[PDB]
C-alpha cells in the first residue's frame, strides 16, 4: 500500500479525459457474539476492468466482484460478519438486482457501501435506487471524516500525514439533498 494509494484513486477528479477508470477498496471483519475480531490489518482492492491476461477486457464490474467475494470466503452463517466497501460511483443495473437479492440470502452480514457521488445510470430508474436503499444494503455519501478513517487503514500514514478539507464535504451536502429526495419518498 502506498501513502497516496487512497488519494490517487480519489484524486481521479481529472480522469475526465474520455477514459473510464474504477477504483474500489473494501475491508473484511469477523465478529463473534462473545468478542469482536477486527481483520482490518488486512485489506484488498477490486477493479471493474476485466483481466488483461486473457486479452482485451471481457467485462467485469468492480461492485459486482465484491458481492461475489463474500460467498467465496464461505462465511459462517452462525458467526456475525461486518464488511464495508468504499467506492465512488453509481452501480450498474445488473448490480442493483444482485445487491438486493444478495442480502436476502445473507441478512446476518452487515454490508455498508459509501458513494462519494451518485449518478443515475438511466431515468425512470429512480425506483431501483429506492429499492437499493432498502435491500441494496445501507448507502450513504462519504464525508471527509469517513475519508480520514480509510486514509489511516488503506495507507500507512506513518511519516505521511493526510490533510483533509471541508471542500468535498460541501459538495456532499448538495448531493445529500438529491439523495434525500429518494429517501424522503420512503413510503411508510
Binding-site residue positions for Zn(2+):
61, 92, 95
- Closest contact distance (angstroms) between CB of 62 and Zn ion is 8
**Residue of 86, 83, 116 lying closest to 102 (CA atoms):** 83
Contact (CB, 8 A) for 64 and 89: no
Q: Looking at beta carbons only, is 64 or 113 nearer to Zn ion?
A: 64
DSSP letter string over 71-93?
HHTT--TTSEEEEEEEE-SPPPH
- Closest contact distance (angstroms) between CB of 102 and Zn ion is 12
C-alpha cell at 22: 474504477
Q: Looking at beta carbons only, is 76 or 121 nearer to Zn ion?
A: 121
Annotated binding site: 61, 92, 95
- Is residue 98 annotated as part of the catalytic site, yes or no? no
**Residue of 150, 132, 148 lying closest to 86 (CA atoms):** 150
CA distance 178 to 167: 18
Binding mask of the shown chain, residues 93 to 122, with x at each position contacting Zn ion by CB under 5 A:
-xx---------------------------
Q: Which parts of 32-91 interact with Zn ion (CB under 5 A)?
A: 61, 64
Minimal CB distance residue for Zn ion: 61
C-alpha cell at 4: 497516496
- Closest contact distance (angstroms) between CB of 94 and Zn ion is 5
Active site residues: 63
Binding-site ranges for Zn ion (CB under 5 A): 61, 64, 92, 94-95
Amino acid at each position: 500500500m502506498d501513502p497516496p494509494t487512497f488519494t490517487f484513486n480519489f484524486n481521479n477528479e481529472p480522469w475526465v479525459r474520455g477514459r473510464h477508470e474504477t477504483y474500489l477498496c473494501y475491508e473484511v471483519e469477523r465478529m463473534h457474539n462473545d468478542t469482536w475480531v477486527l481483520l482490518n490489518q488486512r485489506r484488498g482492492f477490486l477493479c471493474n476492468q476485466a483481466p488483461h491476461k486473457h486479452g482485451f477486457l471481457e467485462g467485469r464490474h468492480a461492485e459486482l466482484c465484491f458481492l461475489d467475494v463474500i460467498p467465496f470466503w464461505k462465511l459462517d452463517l452462525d458467526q456475525d460478519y461486518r464488511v464495508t466497501c468504499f467506492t465512488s460511483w453509481s452501480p450498474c443495473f445488473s448490480c442493483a438486482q444482485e445487491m438486493a437479492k444478495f442480502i436476502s440470502k445473507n441478512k446476518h452480514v452487515s454490508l455498508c457501501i459509501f458513494t462519494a457521488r451518485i449518478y443515475d445510470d438511466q431515468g425512470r430508474c429512480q425506483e431501483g435506487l429506492r429499492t437499493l436503499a432498502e435491500a441494496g444494503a445501507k448507502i450513504s455519501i462519504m464525508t471527509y471524516s469517513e475519508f480520514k478513517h480509510c486514509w489511516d487503514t488503506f495507507v500507512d500514514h506513518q511519516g505521511c500525514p493526510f490533510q483533509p478539507w471541508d471542500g468535498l464535504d460541501e459538495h456532499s451536502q448538495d448531493l445529500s439533498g438529491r439523495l434525500r429526495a429518494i429517501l424522503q419518498n420512503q413510503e411508510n
